Design a protein around this ligand. Structure first.
Ligand SMILES: O=C(Nc1ccccc1Oc1ccc(C(=O)O)c(C(=O)O)c1)c1cccc([N+](=O)[O-])c1
Ligand SMILES: O=C(Nc1ccccc1Oc1ccc(C(=O)O)c(C(=O)O)c1)c1cccc([N+](=O)[O-])c1
Lengths: 813, 813
């Protein structure tokens, strides 16, 4: 209780406010859960709490949207296939200032609130950084008093829950709606129809799309509370419904409604399934009909000229890129605008974001698929391309090749549509997600595009919200900072810069260190409790948490790990800094390497965490089912943050930023937004190692020879032999042959090339750790200059340099 | 408003009670529906009302079941595949005395309650009389203060909604849960597992069922309020859930969960699909594990001796007959009781009800199906049979044939299990549902069974509740009766007998007549409004409402109809009593004849309802989507009730009884409970016509020759020619050839044999109608002696002569 109380950033437990809280808990438990104290179980408790919390939202929810209705601002729609939202109870208490009132209320009903929060299922409706970016963005727009709407798909099943079994990942279905969702509000009365397949008939009206199948889109609105300002914005998520012999026909209703069943779990990868394209069409179609409909109930040919003064539609990737030929379909086919105005209108509405440089992320849809599913869409896509490509010609006379490279339409054995090209044609701004990435888009991936229309290209470096990613997750760090500098920082994270005045403050240095060590103890208790894993709490917590992929170089970390181990065994009496190396995250099913890698990590731990010589000097664990909620526990307990992808492959990162905020030192490469984080802090306050991008490119130019490295480095040679011969898998010596083969002969991500610098850099890290005082002063430097990586920042730039709306922190009544 | 007010049986609109009602409406609309008056739509209104109503249930719900928990009575479980429940809002207001308070409240919120009630989706979780019998029974047990539980399956889809198109039935899916159910309460915390397929391994513990698939049963409890006594009992309905490459495996979750998708729509007919057997196993397994579990948390080898003092399990047909070998499975396999005690226990727990004499209703399951799905069940079924059949032997030495006829196991090309035999072996009482039917079970269908164990065989004539089937549906008739004799009748329907004192009371005769004519006007307004059908309100309303089947003889009615028409055209100037002939009800998909019959009825109406000579003398309409809710409208407006099945095929009937209660005269045969209704009223107060059962049998003995009738009756010959030659279908002359063929050559139900007596009897009916005063005095006689056909009666007999519990009308606090 006693910390929770003392914590000023958690609110007031007002005497009548507590009185009302307890009252509404009992009232919900009686009328909602239909219970008494003798038969409620914890989970009814949770729901009693979560209904009462939500009651505090309602009136603000109604009036905020009433407000948009009356004033009619320009509206921002944020189209994504993913809102990596997490749990919502705390989040909402936080943004409503209710957490110490509800904390006091439930204590006084003889219930620990934190215990009840863990009952909540994450809304895991995303894969990794972009989907979570989307969730951070929702929050920041609310906090900025924007008339923003998030639009997506209500999945049955989010990202699978991960089980490690015999060292392997096992996918289980994430049935997150089993027990109900007290947060959502069904909106039956706003249901729309979505048309699949059919054909196109040209007549004297123009074109007409006929014989279609119909799936209904049913919307479920969810409140996005802003930070303490009495804004509550909406996430609108669509669910598939069948239209309105006998038995087999009812059973088959499944087939149309499987549209919303399940998030595809492929992160940083295009698998080109028609089920996925259907998901993407459904979201787009439904959203844009909602959006037109609004527009037609607001002010007032008068109408569509001004459609872009009134609507902004932000593309979270190419996933909702069909939004472009869809708006053209409506405008053109339904609304009867001439193609050229409708195109002025589209390009002025829509804007695109890139999250990936890697080629195998690109959405390239075979035309036959698009011709069958969405025959009209493909026609409009070809008239898009022709006219775009007549614009490339008129600007680059005779550059045939450029024609071919710019085209929306890719040639081959299977003709495909390059959805990123579609997005470039059809948008008024195209952005990347950190300065380095956005430069590379201009210099490489979309170089010819930049030459055409250089004014389209922008940067918007990512952020994370400091509500979720400090105030919720790390109330100790939040509190000690409010103690010095007050509370404004929470929605003005640049004020953190003020903590630089404390670098030499012995109380502050003591407190910081105290709070991390407190987080380390909790995290440790969680591991013992939930998963009966015993960790050393007086070790350096070395954390790499992120989805599993070759670009991210979990493997290079595993290299390091087997080095520490091998060094130790050489020189057993030598002192070394104690470490807990935590690697965590999911593999996309069917990503073989990634699944290999998960097995290798736990294989390491099998050796390493049973050596008696090692003792408690070194421990390797794999962290299970990394998710949003788990990130809120492990990140506040981390000393070191791993950000080790090759230079040029991590567009930005945001877990980088979460570690930063919460008092973790970073080892990383100058990649993504690691580069801007070292800029903010001074490079002398980070662990940057290895190849810069230019050095990667130089390597590519002559050739990557991993054998060169193997022959030159006896320590690396030792591990490779360890792996081949079967040290990590005695009962199956050959188990890791496809790891080694790939390291040896087909490593696109240059692992061994950054080996020697990574190991030496990790020397540096542990040298610094042996001086507590000096570690904690560098950490202060870190935390004091993470304010640039708030999502308020990022969002205020999108508003001002894309949406053409001004932010705001003025409280609604 | 003004009738609703005056109506004493609807309660008090108390000043603070109205004040609280309005308050809780606004409160629900704000916190639940998240609305204001500017954007709620009617349907949010409904839900605001239905949440506030339900709040009045909760505390009674909790304490009633608390009461069972504390006192521990013997508990009655009522196992059915069907609860033909209907809508619930009004029903609950009624039984809670809240209808004139909520009526006043919503008027004063500027909303008509009746208008909001029509927003509610029927819970159509049944096919016709048995499923509805089940719903009437639930109510009566609550009203009698029994510790009764209804147990069934929560279907996704109830009985299809019926659309007539071009005169045909079109099945649409009944997506009754689209918008949510404010009535149910999910009970996640009572989920059970159900095991399909597998195998049986005999070891030293005995038998063990292994390699099974697991479907989870999730229970949804619903409150059954008793009439004004502060009992609220539970219906517990199970829903199928999947257990806890990647994508196709999540999608396939469907397959196990399709167990609860949909009510099979076959009424009075065995189609032997494995999907249906799975439904039946799921319900049984889940229910009985719930039931054992209770039993193990209540009092206290001690335990299972007394299992029958503590449990009664009533079989609504053979549909949950697997309850017998299931209890044996648990007891035997799980609980380790020796087979003989476990059999003492089973027979003492379980009791069976028959609803059908027809052969093609019987559940006869092929053994291979039962061997694959439910291999252990089949073993226990064969040890059941052997020992039963060793009992038949020891009682009937040398009667081989009897062995063979009694056996559970049927021989043939496909071996089958006779589930009714199973039920007879494994039950302590077997009942029929009206005196004639129960005699026939003894004299025919289960004659050898009766000889063995004559003390098993019983009668329990059906009833209907007078809440739904008078007070709700017919508040005018309810009120004029309370005016004379007070209100006790509502839960003591025998008091109706007191209205015989008014047979010669000119005010009463005037009132009765007034209320029917008021019901006729409403019904008429409903038809114009909802379906734009114009009926003559000064006609005799002649109503045949019931599922469509050959036994029920919709066809014999159609015969009559084309007679009236043909008579008229002969003699156009002749006076005839004006009639509106309403035929209504569903066909099971794939019942061809029944679908033919629906087309024939509307074909009749096409001719008949456009003849100018006919004018408003005669109108034929087919009533669409007959359902529970529709029955509550048309029955109070009916003058004549059609109950015309051959003698011996309608086991009982209950729609007979609903018409009776509400002031309809009956034409029928002496069949089912028509016979006991004529007994109660005096036959001189009914229209009984045609073959008695003995005369059917005599016909069978020599042979039914429909040609005999055709040659002898020029009027019948005229219609048959009309039908063949294409009068009823000019654009498709041959359309009704399969009707005629069947009438002519293969009529199992003897239509033409009851023709001449039916027509003459209908003469009688219209003679009586030309004397209003005399019609209304006979009706009084009818209504005054329908009290035997209350379900309180029926239920109090089950309690006393089967369950071995005493009813009660003592109010809970
Ligand atoms: O009623 C709400 N707000 C009100 C109140 C009065 C008029 C307009 C309101 O909100 C609205 C209503 C309609 C629209 C629309 O999409 O056409 C808009 C809009 O976004 O421009 C805002 C409301 C706000 C938030 C949640 C719910 N809800 O769950 O139903 C309802
Ligand atoms: O809590 C309820 N009643 C109470 C209160 C205290 C103890 C026992 C209660 O009800 C119960 C609880 C458990 C059981 C059981 O099945 O084991 C029984 C029983 O049927 O013998 C009655 C209750 C009654 C009706 C609805 C709900 N509900 O929806 O959860 C809850």
């Amino acid at each position: 209780q006693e910390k929770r109380k003392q914590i000023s950033v958690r609110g007031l437990a007002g005497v009548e406010n507590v009185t009302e809280l307890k009252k509404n808990f009992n009232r919900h438990l009686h009328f909602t859960l239909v219970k008494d104290r003798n038969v409620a179980t914890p989970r009814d408790y949770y729901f009693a709490l979560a209904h009462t919390v939500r009651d505090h939202l309602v009136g603000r929810w109604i009036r905020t949207q009433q407000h948009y209705y009356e004033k009619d601002p320009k509206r921002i729609y944020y189209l994504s296939l993913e809102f990596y939202m997490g749990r919502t109870l705390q989040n909402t208490m936080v943004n409503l200032a209710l957490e110490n009132a509800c904390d006091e209320a439930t204590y006084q009903l003889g219930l620990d609130m934190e215990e009840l929060e863990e009952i909540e299922e994450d809304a895991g409706l995303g894969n990794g950084g972009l989907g979570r970016l989307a969730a951070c963005f929702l929050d920041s727009m609310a906090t900025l008093g924007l008339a923003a709407y998030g639009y997506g798909i209500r999945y049955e099943f989010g990202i699978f829950n991960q089980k490690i079994c015999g060292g392997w990942q096992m996918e289980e279905a994430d049935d997150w709606l089993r027990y109900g969702n007290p947060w959502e509000k069904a909106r039956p009365e706003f249901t729309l129809p979505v048309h699949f397949y059919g054909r196109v008939e040209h007549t004297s009206q123009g074109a007409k799309w006929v014989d279609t199948q119909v799936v209904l889109a049913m919307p479920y609105d969810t409140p996005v509370p802003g930070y303490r300002n009495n804004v509550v914005n909406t996430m609108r998520l669509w669910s598939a419904k069948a239209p309105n012999g006998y038995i087999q026909a009812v059973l088959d209703r499944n087939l149309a409604e499987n549209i919303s069943r399940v998030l595809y779990p492929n992160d940083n990868f295009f698998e080109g399934k028609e089920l996925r394209l259907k998901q993407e069409y459904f979201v787009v179609a439904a959203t844009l009909q909602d959006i037109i409909r609004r527009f037609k109930s607001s002010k007032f040919r008068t109408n569509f000229d001004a459609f872009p003064d009134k609507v902004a539609i932000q593309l979270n990737d190419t996933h909702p890129s069909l939004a472009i030929p869809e708006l053209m379909r409506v405008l053109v086919d339904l609304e009867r605008l001439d193609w050229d105005k409708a195109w002025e209108v589209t390009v002025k509405t829509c804007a695109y974001t890139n999250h990936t440089v890697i080629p195998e992320a690109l959405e390239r849809w075979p035309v036959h698929l698009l011709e069958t599913l969405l025959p009209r869409h493909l026609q409009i896509i070809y008239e898009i391309n022709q006219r775009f490509l007549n614009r490339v010609a008129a600007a680059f006379p005779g550059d045939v090749d450029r024609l071919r490279r710019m085209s929306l339409v890719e040639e081959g054995a299977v003709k495909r549509i390059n959805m990123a090209h579609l997005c470039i044609a059809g948008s008024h701004a195209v952005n990347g997600v950190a300065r380095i990435h956005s430069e590379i888009l201009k210099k490489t991936i979309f170089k010819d595009f930049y030459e055409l229309e250089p004014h389209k290209f922008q940067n918007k470096t990512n952020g994370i919200t400091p509500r979720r990613w400090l105030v919720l997750c790390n109330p100790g760090l939040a509190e000690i900072i409010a103690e010095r500098i007050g509370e404004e920082y929470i929605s003005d994270l640049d004020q953190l810069r003020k903590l630089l005045s404390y670098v030499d403050d012995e109380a502050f240095i003591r407190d910081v260190a105290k709070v991390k060590q407190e987080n380390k103890l909790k995290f440790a208790a969680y591991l013992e409790r939930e998963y009966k894993v015993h960790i050393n709490p007086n070790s350096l917590f070395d954390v790499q948490v992120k989805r599993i992929h070759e670009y991210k170089r979990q493997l290079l970390n595993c290299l390091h790990v087997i080095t520490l181990y091998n060094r130790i065994k050489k020189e057993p009496n030598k002192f070394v800094v104690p470490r807990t190396v935590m690697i965590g995250g999911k593999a996309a099913p069917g990503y073989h390497m990634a699944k290999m890698i998960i097995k290798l990590i736990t294989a390491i731990g099998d050796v390493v965490n049973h050596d008696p010589v090692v003792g408690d000097r070194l421990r390797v664990i794999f962290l299970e089912n990394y998710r949003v909620s788990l990130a809120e526990k492990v990140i506040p307990a981390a000393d070191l943050s791993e950000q080790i992808s090759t230079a040029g492959t991590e567009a930005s990162g945001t877990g980088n930023m979460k570690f930063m905020l919460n008092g973790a030192l970073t080892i990383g490469t100058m990649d993504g937004a690691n580069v801007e984080m070292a800029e903010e802090a001074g490079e002398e306050n980070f662990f940057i190692f290895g190849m810069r991008v230019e050095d990667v490119d130089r390597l590519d130019q002559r050739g990557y020879n991993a054998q060169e490295y193997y022959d030159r480095i006896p320590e690396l040679r030792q591990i490779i032999e360890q792996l081949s011969s079967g040290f990590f898998s005695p009962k199956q010596p050959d188990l890791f042959k496809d790891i080694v083969n790939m390291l040896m002969h087909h490593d696109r991500f240059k692992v061994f090339a950054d080996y020697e610098e990574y190991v030496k850099c990790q020397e540096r890290v542990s040298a610094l750790y042996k001086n507590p005082r000096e570690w904690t002063r560098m950490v202060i430097r870190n935390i004091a200059t993470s304010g640039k990586f708030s999502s308020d920042r990022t969002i205020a730039q999108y508003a001002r340099e894309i949406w053409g709306v001004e932010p705001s922190r003025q409280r609604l009544p």
